[PDB]
Each structure stands twice: as structure tokens, then as C-alpha cells.
Paper text:
Having strong evidence of the binding of EFtsN to PBP1b, we performed co-crystallization assays between PBP1b (positions 58–804), in both the presence and the absence of moenomycin A, which helps in the crystallization of PBP1b, and purified EFtsN (Leu75–Gln93) peptide to identify the binding site of this domain on PBP1b. Crystals, which were only obtained in the presence of moenomycin A, belong to the space group P21212, similar to those of previously reported for PBP1b structures. The structure was solved to 2.4 Å resolution by molecular replacement and showed an additional electron density between the GTase and the UB2H domains. An attempt at shifting the sequence in both directions on the helix did not lead to improved Rfree or electron density. This 13-amino acid helix mostly interacts with the GTase domain and runs approximately parallel to its last α12 helix. Three hydrogen bonds are observed with PBP1b, between the side chain of Trp83 and the main-chain carbonyl of Gln384 (α11α12 loop, GTase domain), between the main-chain carbonyl of Leu89 and side-chain hydroxyl of Thr140 (α1β2 loop, UB2H domain), and between the Glu90 side chain and the Arg141 side chain (α1β2 loop, UB2H), as well as the Leu344 main chain (α9α10 loop, GTase). The GTase domain accounts for most of the interaction with EFtsN, but two residues (Thr140 and Arg141) in the α1β2 loop of the UB2H domain pointing toward the GTase domain are also involved in the binding. Furthermore, the structure reveals that the conserved residues Trp83, Tyr85, and Leu89 of EFtsN, which were shown to be important for the in vivo function of the protein, together with Ile86 and Glu90 are directly involved in the interaction with PBP1b. The binding site of EFtsN is distinct from that of LpoB, which binds the exposed surface of UB2H domain. In the structure of the PBP1b–EFtsN complex, the GTase domain is also characterized by overall poorer electron densities compared with the rest of the protein as well as, compared with the GTase domains of other structures available.
PBP1b has a modular structure, composed of an N-terminal tail and a transmembrane anchor followed by the GTase and TPase catalytic domains separated by the regulatory UB2H domain. PBP1a is mainly involved in cell elongation in partnership with PBP2, whereas PBP1b exhibits a preference for cell division in agreement with its enrichment at midcell during cell constriction. In Escherichia coli, septal PG synthesis and cell constriction rely on the accumulation of FtsN at the division site. Here, we show that EFtsN binds specifically to the major PG synthase PBP1b and is sufficient to stimulate its biosynthetic glycosyltransferase (GTase) activity.
Residue numbers in the entry:
A (entry chain B): 79 to 91
B (entry chain A): 74 to 236, 269 to 280, 284 to 399, 402 to 799
The structure:
Amino acid sequence: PEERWRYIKELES
Amino acid sequence: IVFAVLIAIYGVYLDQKIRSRIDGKVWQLPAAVYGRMVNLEPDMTISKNEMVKLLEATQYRQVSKMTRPGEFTVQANSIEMIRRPFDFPDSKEGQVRARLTFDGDHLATIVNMENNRQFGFFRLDPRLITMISSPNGEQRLFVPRSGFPDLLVDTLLATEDRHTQQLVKNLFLSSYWRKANEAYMALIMDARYSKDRILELYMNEVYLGQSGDNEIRGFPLASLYYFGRPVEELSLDQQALLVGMVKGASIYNPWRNPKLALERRNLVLRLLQQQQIIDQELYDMLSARPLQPRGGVISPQPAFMQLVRQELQAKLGDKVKDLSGVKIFTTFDSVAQDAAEKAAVEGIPALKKQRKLSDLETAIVVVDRFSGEVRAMVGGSEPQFAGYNRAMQARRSIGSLAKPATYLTALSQPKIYRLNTWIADAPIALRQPNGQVWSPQNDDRRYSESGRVMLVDALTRSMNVPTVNLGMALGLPAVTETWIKLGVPKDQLHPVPAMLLGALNLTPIEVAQAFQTIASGGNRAPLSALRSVIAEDGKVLYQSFPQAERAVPAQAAYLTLWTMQQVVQRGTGRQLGAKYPNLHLAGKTGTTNNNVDTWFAGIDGSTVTITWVGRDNNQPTKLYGASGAMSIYQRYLANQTPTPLNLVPPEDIADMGVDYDGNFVCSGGMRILPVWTSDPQSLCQQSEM
């Protein structure tokens, strides 16, 4: 799902 | 069918062996040694830039935006941080998002960002300095299931099981026939234990590296060793390598072979990018990120740990290493230690190149002015590899740094000795047994025109002849009694006239205690490195309490510190008073015959800092006066933010005016001096002549 990958972008940026 | 009975009864013995280790003491966990715990309050004298270095020294990271704990961001007049969780002794605490806001040279507010409400006080987690060496050589840091991030668990399971088999291997087995034993004992515990507990024991047991002759194993201790941050705050790129090193710890080591270890992280990032958990949108970001710490560490802080190790069995007994999961809370200050280590690393070659010296060494010791808590300790010129600790082991002559003890003894007699009492300054010749006459000389080999100087100026200028005339008028046991009250070793005191001008061999930590007793206003505080010692179950083993023992009168100590402010402004230490006048620093210089040893005892509002500069073979340093030891202290004052010494005069202190002839005046005068009096009407007794 896209709810897992989107959270990881703002966590690693 | 007898084989079914043998394997069934064997499984009960395996089940009994697993239950014995897992239900009780699993491993002999070594003692974690933490630094100081800094509380923050409104109107606290700390700047924004001073807080940045405190945070970076406590393993925090300056970032654009905060995501995981142990991170912060700087603004024009504020810092936003996520205070990491830490099981403190007074209360357990979680993550806390807060803004520290500054006005000028003070912390105005501390506001929780989740509720937009102030904090009366805010705790800062202590830095984990090191682990105490174990006999077996299996160094670990226990972290329960709650402490590991869920992405690190997903990265592990994706590359191993993907629903434990290698947990049983490293538990009780060694190095084809016993693979069936590994398979039987794995299924026995997997069924008789929780799904969460199997990840907890595995993540603390796995081998990830080596540090000399001790095995660093488990994700928590490995994270701090390889990256300088806990397991909770690992970035997915750092998690991939730490998970990747589980199969080849030694072969994928970044110190021995960086190129080989770099390929493993990208390989593990592909195993998770191919699966659901990650996509190609961020592979370019994580594949570019290189791995941070430089060459690991075998023994961090060897000098300070000597005092911690000495104090541990001296307070709790050697019956302590047997206990597992001990928590040692020390008084260590990372800001001051980092400031002192640079001042010693940079300051030594700066003196060797300027004065053309072959070798030169140093030792610095910082302690709390009121509590005597040891904040920092440098015991060498290069603390990269330090076997010898000069701050504790090198016992040298204190020299002129012995002069304040004589003036303290004098100024404790208000009714006879004051700051305006005259001391003679003319040729001296003191006869002694065996054998020649002792004729002491000033550094100048000069005497005063009037044949006298007032007490205050003799200490300010470190005048040898008047110190002998004063010291011998009081008597050598009266001066030696003050050294005992100041907290120095009694076995090192030899009460002869040489003692008055520095015939006294002390180490920097013993000098630290003497000046600390003065710094507090005559209250001896036994120097300590430990704050508390806690067990694995939260029960306290040792806990410090205040031990401020009234050594000398507060008024005597005050006038001696007031005179030590004149030493640094206009006297022997005039160099430092011109650099840092706003601190109003109190201190004393130390020089021996032929400058074999040089010193400086520097007191600020918050601490006492003793610094020694000399050679290991007891030879002339070829350095002018105490400028060698003062330049190292200047570098320490420069490297961190000192606290201004604004002395608060105790009761019975009267600022009195004296004429050129050194007598008190009723109205007016031409030199103001603090003087220990309840009724300042001595002026009447002087003016009726």
C-alpha cells in the first residue's frame, strides 16, 4: 500500500 | 519403536536447559557508564550556541527537520529538539518534542510542542561513555522489544525467516551431526515462548563486531559503536548494513575494508526494495548515503575511568562485577572534557614549536566549585592512546601554587592579620639543622624601597621573601594545619620552611581538592566521580549525598579569593585578566626552581580548573614562568563557555578605605579593601593618632 511508502519519504527526508 | 522414547525424553532435558537460562539470568550484562544529567530551567544562564554544543556532545544531530528522537534544529533565537527516551533514576521518560527559546545569554522558556505549555524543569539524557570490561569478553547492551524500531524488525525478518533458527546456534552450541539438535531445540522454544520475545533475545545476541579482545554483539551496543547513535534512531540505510553484518561481521567491517562493507548495504537495500516494504522512489537516496565515527574505540576516556574504577570498589566493594545490568551514573561533563582535550592536544605543540621544545606534557582537572564533583580530567598531551594518567599518577612540586595556604592561615586571624597588614621585605637568613643557612630570594632578587609590602600585594605578586616572613610568624604547624583542612594527603606534608614556597609534591586531583575547599568559601567537598549506582531491577546500590565540611572561615576564604582575583587582573596572572575581564576570574600561578613544573589554579563562578605543564623526566621546560600552564587554561576557557565569578561576600565583610601609609580612614581613603569586621569602626582607633 501507498500509506507505508509515503510515511517513509517524510521520515528519511 | 524405542527411538520415539529416546528423542521424547531427550527433549525434556533440552526444555529444562532452555528454561533454566531464559527464565532468569540470560547473559552477564556489563555495567553501562553514563555521564552527567543536565536539567534545564527558565532564566538559566545558557546561550543558544552553548546549548548546541551540549546537544551535539550528548549524541544529538543538527537536522533540517526532526523525524526520529535525538535530533534538533537551530533558529535565530530558539532550538527545537526531540528529547530521546531514557530510564532516569527519579522517573522513567518517553520521547519529548520541545522548544528551548533564548532571550540573550539565558534560556527564557522550554515549551512542550505537543501541548504548547511551559516546563518548570526539563531533563537531558546522559551520554553513554563506555561499558566496564567483562571476564568472558561478550560485551552487550540490553534493549527489550519496545526499543527496536518496527522497520529494523521488518528488515531483519525479510532477509532471514519471513513468516529464530540462528538464535539457538549462538546460545548453547559450538562448531554436521548436531544440526538436528539445533532443529529440535529451535521448535521446542518457538512453541513454548512468545513471538515478540524471540526477536528480543536474537537482536541482543547476534555478533556484529570486535573491539580489541572483546566481542561487541547485539544491535544496541553495535549502533553506538558503528554510528554513534542508539538502535531506536537508525536510518533505514544504517539499519540495512547493521542487518547485513549479521552474516559476515568481520568481512563486512567498515574499518578493515570499507569498499567490501559498502556493497553489502546496497545488497540488503535491494532485498527490501524488491519486496513490498520499500519501492524504487528512494533507492537513489539511500544508495548514495555513505555509511560517522572514525576508526571506532577500544578505551574511551581512560583518564576519567581510572577515578570511576577506583571510587567504585572503594565505596561498594569489589563484590559488584558479579551483578548483571548495572547502571553507573557519573559526574562527567562532555562539553568540558572536549574543551580540555582540545586545549591539551592543540596547546602542547603550540608551546613546543614557539619555545623549540623536544617534548612537553600536561594534565588538566576540572571540578565543581561547591560540590567537588569531577567534571573533566585530561592526563596527557595526546589522549588518542593514553596509558599513563598524569592527572592522578604524576606527583609533582606545586611551587608558588602553595602561597595561598599561608595567606589563608593569616587572614583567618581578623583581629591581628588583614589585607592591609605590612609584611617585611628585606634580606632573610634562616639557620636550620644540617646545615647551611637558608637565604630565600624573590624572583626579581630585589627588595621594596620602604622595606615592606602589604599582605594583599605579596600574594598578588607571589613575593617569596614576604611569604617566608609571614609563614614563619604564623608558625609552620599553623600553615600545615590549613593544608590538612584543605584536604591534601597528610603523608605528603613535611613542615619545614621550604614547604611555605612549594616543597610539597601533589598530583593535579589533590591540588583540585585544595583549591575546591577555598573556592566554596572554606567548605571541603570530597572530590567524587560517581552520582549513583543502580541495579538492573531499578534498586539503588550507591547514591551520593552532600559532604560539605567547614574547613576554614568563610570570610578568610572570601578575602583569599578576592586577592586571587587581583592575582589574575594585576598580579602574576595579569595575562588572563586582560583576555577575560568580564569573568572576574580568581586564580594562582605555579612555578618551581628552574621551571621543572608550571601550574595554574583557575576558579570561575561554577568550577575550579587545575592545569599542570611539565616534562615526564623532571627537566627544565625552557618556558617563561607560569605562561606554559596559563596558555593551556586560556585555550580551555576559549574552547567552552566559562561562568563569571561574581563573589558574594559573607557576613562581617566591610569594604574599608586605607591611606598611602596603609591605615584605615574614617571618611574617604585612596584604596578600598574588603575587611573581616562586625563593627567597621577600626577607623576610629587609627584616626586618633
